[PDB]
Amino acid sequence: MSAIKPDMKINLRMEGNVNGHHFVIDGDGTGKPFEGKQSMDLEVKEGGPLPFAFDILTTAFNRVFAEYPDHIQDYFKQSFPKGYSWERSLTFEDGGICIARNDITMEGDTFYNKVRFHGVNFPANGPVMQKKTLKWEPSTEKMYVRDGVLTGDITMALLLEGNAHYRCDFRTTYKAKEKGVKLPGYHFVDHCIEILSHDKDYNKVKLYEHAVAHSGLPD
Amino acid sequence: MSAIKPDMKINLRMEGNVNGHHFVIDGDGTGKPFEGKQSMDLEVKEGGPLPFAFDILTTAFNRVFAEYPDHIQDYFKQSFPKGYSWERSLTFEDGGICIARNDITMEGDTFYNKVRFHGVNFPANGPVMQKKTLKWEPSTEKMYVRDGVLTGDITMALLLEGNAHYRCDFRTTYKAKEKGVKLPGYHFVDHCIEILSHDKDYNKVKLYEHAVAHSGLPD
Amino acid sequence: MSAIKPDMKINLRMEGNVNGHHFVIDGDGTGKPFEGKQSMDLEVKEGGPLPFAFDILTTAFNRVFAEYPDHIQDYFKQSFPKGYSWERSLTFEDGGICIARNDITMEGDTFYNKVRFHGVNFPANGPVMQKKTLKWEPSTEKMYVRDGVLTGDITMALLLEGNAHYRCDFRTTYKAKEKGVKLPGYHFVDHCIEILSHDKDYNKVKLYEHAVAHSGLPD
Amino acid sequence: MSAIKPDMKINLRMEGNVNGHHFVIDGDGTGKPFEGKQSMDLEVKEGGPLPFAFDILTTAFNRVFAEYPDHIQDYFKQSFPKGYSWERSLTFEDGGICIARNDITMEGDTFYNKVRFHGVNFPANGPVMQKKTLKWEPSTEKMYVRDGVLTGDITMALLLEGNAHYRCDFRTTYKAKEKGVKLPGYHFVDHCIEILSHDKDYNKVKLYEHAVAHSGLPD
């Protein structure tokens, strides 16, 4: 390594607006980048209790925390100490659309995250505004280059009650602050994000993520 | 009318971020709500010169300015004095996605607009980041009710340098502040938006829009 | 006109498969191309009674029948005597997707139509498989050139029972058989298609369409 | 297993039309359902030489051939001896859209496949009509139930000459012929399909696929 330590701290601040509802959320966590694991304690500072499903926000709360094999270029760890930023569009199957971005920096053993999240057109009686989501199912992000920019497309899904699912398509564009960072070839990153615990109105949430990069079958 | 006068003034302020670029734009205009015509002078206050096509922002700079026939319920004019707000998603064909919102209020003979505009995933060499757009073509917005909310869907297109077109799909949701405003039936609203004048880097722009509601064929 | 007559006959045969159900439908009608009006009597020869809403098929049952103004190039009437063909994708909001095609020829005062229609992934309890549709709302097709081919994109909507709408996005590509047919500029074509009458299971249906091309506002 | 043997034979016949081009392709192959592996020799009977990229057709040439772990319900193997059928929509990022379906039956140790493939709106200068595809990248299909039907959504990509990728979204619906077959819970199926060899104009092609079901991270 050198720039990134086996054990890193995580500082985050999110501000956003969904369907006209404003909110500010603080995060404090720790993680093991080389093992692709991280945990974070979230505290809603303004706008709580959120009138929408907390789950839509969780992936906004850093691909640095992903276990990359030696045969696959790790664009994220190679982006530090300078850092990088990402933008994302979350297209839900019922018309709800969100965009999010995060500017990631590093100071010592801590990653700093300036996050913004905006969402519109969620149906009033949909699972998001009615808070009927249970969790995101694990996923496999497809990483590839588009017009010189590392891009990740994902078939995501939120589990609802009675074993039904609510689909969302993700497209994330990753850009290192520093020019010249070597781009990886087409690959994958498996993810599993989960809310380990939370209070009744999700004003306090403990989040966790495990991610591993790979080259898919047959390797 | 009653609450809305034949000649209204327009005050507007937009704050946004497209592809990581922050910006603030002020607007000052006038319009004839009953004739579906309005004009406005825009001035970039922060973030100038914008590194993207000014055209993506223009429709963000009020359906009250649309000529509604007596046989079609005018949800927008009926939303005042209290006012209304809208949310929109602009999905471009090359992956770029924007979401915008406008909270509209009225004090005297002036409409006030609190607008926000966010855009992500625009390709570096796409027409937006390369400023190769010329104008939005006229359009026809399809207005209908979805889950109790007035919704407008549009097949939009930007004429590009070179004579080709760049498609964008619009979905706007409109919500009156006052509960109980009668919802209209399925109808249409023709639009024509144009930048009348502008300086080199569009730090100063004069915008115009003409809109008329109708019931399509055969009527 | 010269090639196309004010009064034309229409012969058509459609073969298709929706959600695994095969069918063949024959049609005979008449229309006035220069007035953009046509009518046709349809009869299900094989596959009756259809297990899905007949409405999804109706637009598959010729833009020659559209009233074009002198200032807009009429790509369709100019395609005969040789004729033309079109392909179309109908993407419904619930995942249902259909593609269709029509190879159009002419002999004397009659247009012949070789139509094919295929639909997949319609939810078992959706409005299509449950036959809960009432009609297509009138529309405005946006005509433009894409990669050298005349294309028509449309925000279509099926009015459903219960005062709700079911959206479908249309993309039709039109290609003249003979080279040198001048391509028109960006324009619109208003449409209004309706099933005038039908028997209980829609084995026999009378269809009608009125269409007018135009330049949109302010012209 | 019982109904399905460790070694099975595959008999297939595809009939289709892409951008107006008709074709008939026969297939003969073998595979090991429990190992999730299969191979097949294809031969174009009518329509050769195909004017479009052969790669768009390959996934149309049976999830029975997928290694399913004991902890995940195998809807496919439990569908025999009666069999099952599937429908698929392939939405390419440039507007090209294809639908396909396969009715799969079994007699002895041989699977019989009645396949149909139709495609429309492929741009003349797109990679499909210009035959610039190299291969499909490996993928991970997300399996879940929508309206009582097993559904698979996939973020697919074709590697193109020149190192870039061309995206396509897959949605396949799977339906057992026999009522009752237990529906699985949300899961995944990794895929890797490759053309092992082919002659000049792809009139003869040797295809191969490897697939393995799994529960994602952390398991």
Side-chain angles (χ1 to χ4, degrees), chain A residues 3-219, chain B residues 3-219, chain C residues 3-219, chain D residues 3-219:
Chain A
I4 299 179
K5 272 49 184 174
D7 291 278
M8 295 291 295
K9 291 181 175 181
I10 310 176
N11 183 290
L12 177 157
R13 177 164 189 293
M14 174 191 278
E15 179 160 344
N17 182 306
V18 168
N19 266 43
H21 298 104
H22 174 70
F23 57 90
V24 176
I25 301 174
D26 282 353
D28 177 63
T30 55
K32 294 171 175 293
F34 300 96
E35 298 189 5
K37 297 177 184 183
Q38 68 177 311
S39 183
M40 180 182 281
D41 294 299
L42 306 160
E43 290 187 33
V44 174
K45 293 300 180 180
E46 302 182 11
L50 301 183
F52 60 83
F54 194 92
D55 285 320
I56 70 170
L57 303 174
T58 62
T59 66
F61 299 128
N62 181 359
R63 207 69 53 261
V64 151
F65 296 93
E67 181 193 354
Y68 267 77
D70 294 357
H71 61 100
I72 304 176
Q73 163 68 191
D74 190 331
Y75 186 78
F76 310 95
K77 292 185 181 65
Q78 293 293 150
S79 288
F80 292 84
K82 192 62 180 180
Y84 73 104
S85 61
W86 56 256
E87 293 192 310
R88 177 178 306 153
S89 57
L90 295 79
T91 301
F92 295 84
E93 67 171 298
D94 64 352
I97 292 184
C98 298
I99 63 83
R101 54 170 65 80
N102 184 5
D103 298 316
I104 307 176
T105 49
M106 182 195 250
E107 302 287 55
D109 64 353
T110 302
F111 286 118
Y112 294 86
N113 306 256
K114 182 190 174 188
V115 185
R116 292 294 178 277
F117 187 107
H118 296 278
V120 299
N121 301 343
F122 276 111
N125 291 297
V128 173
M129 296 317 294
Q130 290 306 312
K131 294 171 60 174
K132 295 211 62 179
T133 66
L134 298 182
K135 59 155 180 175
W136 285 102
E137 291 287 357
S139 73
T140 295
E141 172 175 27
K142 278 63 183 299
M143 296 284 214
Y144 66 102
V145 175
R146 176 181 295 275
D147 196 5
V149 174
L150 182 53
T151 306
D153 285 344
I154 319 178
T155 291
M156 293 287 280
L158 281 161
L159 171 69
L160 310 181
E161 320 192 32
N163 189 62
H165 287 82
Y166 172 56
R167 288 270 289 101
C168 180
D169 283 347
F170 275 31
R171 165 160 297 174
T172 304
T173 51
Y174 305 96
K175 302 180 176 179
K177 302 179 187 299
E178 172 176 289
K179 300 187 179 184
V181 180
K182 195 226 297 177
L183 292 169
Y186 198 97
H187 67 279
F188 318 79
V189 175
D190 289 344
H191 296 265
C192 180
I193 187 171
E194 350 169 66
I195 291 178
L196 299 179
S197 62
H198 59 81
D199 60 352
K200 313 178 193 304
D201 286 322
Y202 299 77
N203 291 310
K204 286 188 177 180
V205 178
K206 189 177 218 65
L207 194 64
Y208 175 71
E209 190 207 344
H210 179 15
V212 181
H214 62 86
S215 303
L217 287 178
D219 302 2
Chain B
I4 302 178
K5 291 73 174 183
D7 298 83
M8 295 296 288
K9 292 180 175 59
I10 313 175
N11 181 287
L12 177 162
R13 180 159 183 291
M14 167 191 282
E15 294 198 18
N17 184 313
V18 171
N19 253 53
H21 192 86
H22 167 75
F23 62 80
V24 174
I25 303 175
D26 282 355
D28 182 78
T30 59
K32 299 178 180 180
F34 298 89
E35 296 183 9
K37 304 167 187 169
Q38 71 179 309
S39 185
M40 178 182 287
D41 292 297
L42 304 155
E43 183 171 301
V44 176
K45 297 297 187 175
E46 310 187 15
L50 300 181
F52 58 84
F54 197 93
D55 287 318
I56 70 172
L57 312 174
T58 60
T59 66
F61 296 129
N62 182 358
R63 207 66 57 264
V64 169
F65 292 93
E67 175 183 345
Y68 267 82
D70 291 349
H71 63 100
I72 300 178
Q73 166 62 182
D74 191 328
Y75 188 77
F76 313 97
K77 292 188 174 66
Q78 290 286 174
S79 291
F80 294 79
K82 191 63 179 180
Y84 75 106
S85 68
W86 59 257
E87 285 172 22
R88 176 179 308 154
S89 64
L90 300 76
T91 299
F92 296 88
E93 65 167 294
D94 64 347
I97 288 184
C98 298
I99 58 180
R101 66 174 317 89
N102 181 12
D103 295 301
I104 306 175
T105 49
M106 176 197 259
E107 305 295 55
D109 66 354
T110 301
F111 283 117
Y112 293 84
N113 305 258
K114 176 185 177 185
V115 187
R116 292 294 176 286
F117 186 110
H118 299 271
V120 299
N121 302 340
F122 278 113
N125 297 303
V128 175
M129 299 314 285
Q130 289 301 310
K131 298 164 64 178
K132 309 198 72 180
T133 65
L134 300 177
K135 61 156 188 174
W136 281 108
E137 288 289 355
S139 66
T140 297
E141 171 171 32
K142 277 61 186 298
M143 295 285 210
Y144 64 101
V145 178
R146 172 183 295 277
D147 194 18
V149 171
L150 185 53
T151 306
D153 283 347
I154 321 175
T155 296
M156 295 285 279
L158 280 160
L159 173 58
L160 301 179
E161 292 184 0
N163 189 63
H165 282 82
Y166 173 55
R167 289 266 289 97
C168 179
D169 284 346
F170 275 34
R171 168 159 296 173
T172 304
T173 47
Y174 305 94
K175 302 177 180 178
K177 312 183 191 299
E178 171 177 291
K179 307 174 182 177
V181 181
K182 179 191 295 182
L183 292 165
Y186 198 97
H187 67 279
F188 316 77
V189 180
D190 290 336
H191 295 269
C192 180
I193 186 170
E194 330 171 64
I195 283 184
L196 297 177
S197 60
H198 63 80
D199 51 23
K200 311 184 187 316
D201 297 291
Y202 300 74
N203 285 305
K204 298 187 180 180
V205 181
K206 179 185 182 180
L207 191 65
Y208 175 76
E209 190 211 347
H210 176 35
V212 180
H214 63 85
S215 306
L217 287 171
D219 296 359
Chain C
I4 292 177
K5 280 56 182 176
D7 301 290
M8 292 295 300
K9 292 298 180 60
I10 313 167
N11 181 269
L12 174 162
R13 179 171 179 291
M14 167 187 284
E15 192 163 7
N17 183 310
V18 172
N19 259 47
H21 193 86
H22 166 72
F23 57 88
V24 178
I25 302 175
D26 284 345
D28 298 86
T30 59
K32 303 177 181 180
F34 304 94
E35 293 183 4
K37 301 180 175 184
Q38 70 177 313
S39 194
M40 178 182 281
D41 290 301
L42 303 160
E43 195 190 320
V44 180
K45 300 300 177 181
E46 311 179 12
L50 300 177
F52 57 83
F54 199 86
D55 285 320
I56 69 167
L57 310 167
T58 64
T59 69
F61 298 125
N62 184 351
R63 207 66 55 261
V64 160
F65 294 99
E67 182 188 2
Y68 266 80
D70 284 357
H71 56 102
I72 302 176
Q73 163 71 178
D74 192 322
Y75 184 78
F76 309 98
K77 290 186 178 69
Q78 285 292 98
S79 287
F80 296 81
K82 297 293 183 176
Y84 75 105
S85 66
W86 57 256
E87 301 191 318
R88 177 180 304 156
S89 58
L90 301 76
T91 305
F92 296 83
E93 63 169 294
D94 64 352
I97 288 182
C98 300
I99 59 178
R101 69 188 337 296
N102 188 5
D103 299 311
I104 308 177
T105 52
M106 178 193 249
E107 291 301 326
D109 66 353
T110 303
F111 285 121
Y112 297 82
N113 306 257
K114 179 182 180 182
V115 186
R116 297 296 180 271
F117 189 107
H118 293 274
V120 301
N121 305 340
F122 277 111
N125 293 288
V128 173
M129 297 315 292
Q130 291 294 314
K131 295 165 64 176
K132 294 197 61 178
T133 72
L134 287 172
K135 64 166 186 179
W136 282 106
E137 291 282 356
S139 70
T140 294
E141 173 176 25
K142 279 62 188 300
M143 293 287 204
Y144 67 105
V145 177
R146 168 178 291 278
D147 200 40
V149 167
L150 183 57
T151 305
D153 284 345
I154 318 171
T155 295
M156 294 284 281
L158 276 166
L159 169 64
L160 305 173
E161 307 177 15
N163 186 43
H165 285 79
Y166 173 52
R167 289 264 294 100
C168 182
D169 284 352
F170 275 31
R171 169 160 291 169
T172 303
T173 50
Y174 306 96
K175 304 177 181 186
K177 306 183 196 298
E178 168 180 283
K179 290 178 172 179
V181 181
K182 200 231 300 180
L183 290 165
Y186 198 95
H187 70 280
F188 320 80
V189 176
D190 289 333
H191 294 271
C192 180
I193 186 170
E194 335 166 65
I195 289 179
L196 301 178
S197 62
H198 62 84
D199 61 358
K200 296 190 186 304
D201 287 310
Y202 290 78
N203 287 311
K204 289 186 180 180
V205 176
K206 184 176 171 180
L207 194 66
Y208 176 78
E209 190 208 342
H210 178 17
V212 177
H214 64 84
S215 302
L217 289 182
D219 294 356
Chain D
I4 302 179
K5 289 66 179 186
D7 294 293
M8 295 290 284
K9 281 178 298 172
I10 310 171
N11 182 297
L12 176 161
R13 176 170 181 285
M14 168 191 281
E15 212 175 80
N17 182 314
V18 170
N19 252 50
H21 194 81
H22 164 73
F23 57 89
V24 176
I25 303 173
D26 286 345
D28 178 69
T30 64
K32 296 184 182 179
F34 300 96
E35 299 189 4
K37 299 188 174 186
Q38 67 176 313
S39 177
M40 181 183 297
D41 295 297
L42 303 156
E43 190 180 317
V44 180
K45 295 300 187 174
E46 307 181 8
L50 299 177
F52 60 82
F54 194 92
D55 284 322
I56 71 173
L57 309 178
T58 61
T59 66
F61 299 126
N62 186 352
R63 210 67 57 259
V64 156
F65 298 96
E67 173 188 340
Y68 265 76
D70 293 359
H71 64 98
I72 300 179
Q73 155 71 181
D74 191 334
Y75 186 80
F76 308 103
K77 293 187 181 64
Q78 299 274 190
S79 292
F80 295 85
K82 193 62 180 180
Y84 75 107
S85 69
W86 58 255
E87 290 193 313
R88 178 176 308 155
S89 62
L90 297 80
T91 302
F92 296 86
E93 67 172 295
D94 64 349
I97 293 184
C98 301
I99 63 86
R101 50 167 62 79
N102 187 358
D103 293 303
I104 305 176
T105 50
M106 184 196 265
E107 294 297 45
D109 60 348
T110 306
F111 286 117
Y112 292 80
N113 306 255
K114 178 190 177 190
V115 183
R116 293 294 180 275
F117 186 109
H118 299 279
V120 300
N121 298 345
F122 274 116
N125 305 311
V128 174
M129 297 311 293
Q130 290 294 321
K131 300 181 184 169
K132 302 200 71 178
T133 67
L134 297 183
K135 61 155 184 169
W136 286 102
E137 288 292 356
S139 69
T140 297
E141 174 172 25
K142 279 64 184 303
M143 298 280 210
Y144 65 102
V145 176
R146 177 185 292 282
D147 199 0
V149 172
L150 178 58
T151 306
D153 283 345
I154 318 175
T155 293
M156 295 281 280
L158 278 158
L159 172 68
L160 307 180
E161 170 80 11
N163 299 297
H165 287 81
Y166 171 53
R167 288 271 289 98
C168 180
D169 284 352
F170 272 34
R171 170 161 293 172
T172 305
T173 48
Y174 306 94
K175 301 176 182 179
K177 305 184 195 297
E178 161 181 287
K179 294 183 183 177
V181 185
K182 184 240 296 174
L183 289 167
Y186 198 97
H187 67 280
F188 315 82
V189 179
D190 288 341
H191 289 274
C192 180
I193 190 171
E194 321 165 55
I195 288 186
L196 302 186
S197 56
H198 62 79
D199 63 352
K200 292 172 171 292
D201 306 301
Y202 294 76
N203 282 311
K204 295 190 174 183
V205 177
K206 179 179 176 180
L207 195 65
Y208 174 75
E209 189 210 341
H210 183 15
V212 180
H214 63 88
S215 301
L217 288 175
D219 298 348

